[PDB]
From a paper:
One of these energy-consuming enzymes is the conserved huge AAA+-type ATPase Rea1 (also known as Mdn1), which is composed of a hexameric AAA+-ATPase domain, followed by a long tail consisting of an α-helical linker region, a flexible aspartate/glutamate (D/E)-rich domain and a C-terminal metal-ion-dependent adhesion site (MIDAS) homologous to the inserted (I) domain within the α-subunits (αI) of integrins that mediate ligand recognition. The conserved interaction between the C-terminal Rea1-MIDAS and the Rsa4-UBL (ubiquitin-like domain) or Ytm1-UBL is essential for assembly of the 60S pre-ribosome in a reaction mediated by the Rea1 ATPase upon ATP hydrolysis that leads to the removal of Ytm1 and Rsa4 from distinct pre-60S intermediates. In this study, we report crystal structures of the Chaetomium thermophilum (Ct) Rea1-MIDAS, both alone and in complex with its pre-ribosomal substrates, the CtYtm1- or CtRsa4-UBL domains. Besides displaying the typical MIDAS fold known for integrins, the CtRea1-MIDAS crystal structures reveal evolutionary conserved Rea1 specific structural elements.
However, due to the low yield and solubility of this construct, we switched to the thermostable Rea1-MIDAS from C. thermophilum (Ct). This construct (CtRea1-MIDAS) carries a ~105 residue-long N-terminal extension, which is absent from integrin MIDAS domains but is known to contribute to Ytm1 and Rsa4 binding both in yeast and human. We were able to purify the CtRea1-MIDAS construct in sufficient amount to allow us to obtain crystals and determine its crystal structure at 2.3 Å (for data collection and refinement statistics). However, the CtRea1-MIDAS contains three additional conserved structural elements (termed elements I, II and III) that are not present in integrin-MIDAS domains. The first half of the Rea1-specific N-terminal extension contains a long α-helix (element I), which wraps around the MIDAS domain core. Although this part of the N-terminal extension (amino acids 4693–4732) has a low-sequence conservation, it contains an invariant tryptophan residue in the first part of the helix (W4710 in C. thermophilum and W4633 in S. cerevisiae), which packs between helices α3 and α4 and most likely anchors the N-terminal helix in place. The second Rea1-specific MIDAS element (II, termed loop) forms a 45 amino-acid-long disordered loop (amino acids 4733–4777) opposite the critical DxSxS motif. The third MIDAS element (III) is located in the C-terminal region preceding the last α-helix of the classical α/β Rossmann fold. Rigid body fitting of the CtRea1-MIDAS into the density map of S. pombe Rea1 unambiguously identified the Rea1-MIDAS loop attached to the Rea1-AAA+ inner pore ring.
Numbering used by the authors: 4693 to 4743, 4753 to 4886, 4891 to 4935, 4942 to 5000
Amino acid sequence: DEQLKRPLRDYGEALEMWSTFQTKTQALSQSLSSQLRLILTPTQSTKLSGAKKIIPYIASSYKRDKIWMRRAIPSKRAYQILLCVDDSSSMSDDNRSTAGNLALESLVMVARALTVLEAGQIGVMGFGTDVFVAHALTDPPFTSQDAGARVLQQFTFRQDSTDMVLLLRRTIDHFREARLIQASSEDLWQLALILSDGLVQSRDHARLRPLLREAMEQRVMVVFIVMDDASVLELKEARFGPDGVPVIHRYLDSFPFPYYLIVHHLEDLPGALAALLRTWFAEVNSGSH
């Protein structure tokens, strides 16, 4: 907490960032939210049992189908997503890497998609040497521009190291805290989405294993998104829409084990987050297991 007295970004600047990223990602946020709504909607087909054709008059009103929808998505299941963003200087790289910005832009895309969807809670954590909650799961969803500015303010990408072990334990802790709350008024699905740049040497994989093992016993699912790009001003201009990758086939196949999605091109970052989220929502939702 004492290390947290870093200076924040200028509010006007963070406000303009949020607004710019929202405009740049709105198409993808809207598409993704319509895909997640479809995934959560009961859509199982009818089934055959046992063993002139009658042609009944089958009619309904579109009005009535919107009413069925208002009751259709069950509130017994909630989704909790912690989006964890590397707050170290490796993300800034003296403006050379540009990864920090693309990561915040992806955060905006996800936050807007979950808000429009009106299902799930979003939380945001930053991590480097310390770990801070930039936006708690119990905070109001990102409908207001102030709430978006305030999250982006907290990310300046100047911590000097990345301590993945600490991030994992706090993430586990925060999810445990969240499970206790719902035990006293509720099926709860929890996902940590961890974005960072650089390399992973397997010296890194191994020391994460006990915590990841602990997370799995607590049904927490963990996905690492690893950015490693080897220009900057047209990223500024870039507009994001659907890129044609609905799911991560390999992650679907490994569910619910921890997964590393390696993203070599930063303009794929928002696409890759969208695809991971669709995959996860599809998996936690299927009656499987």
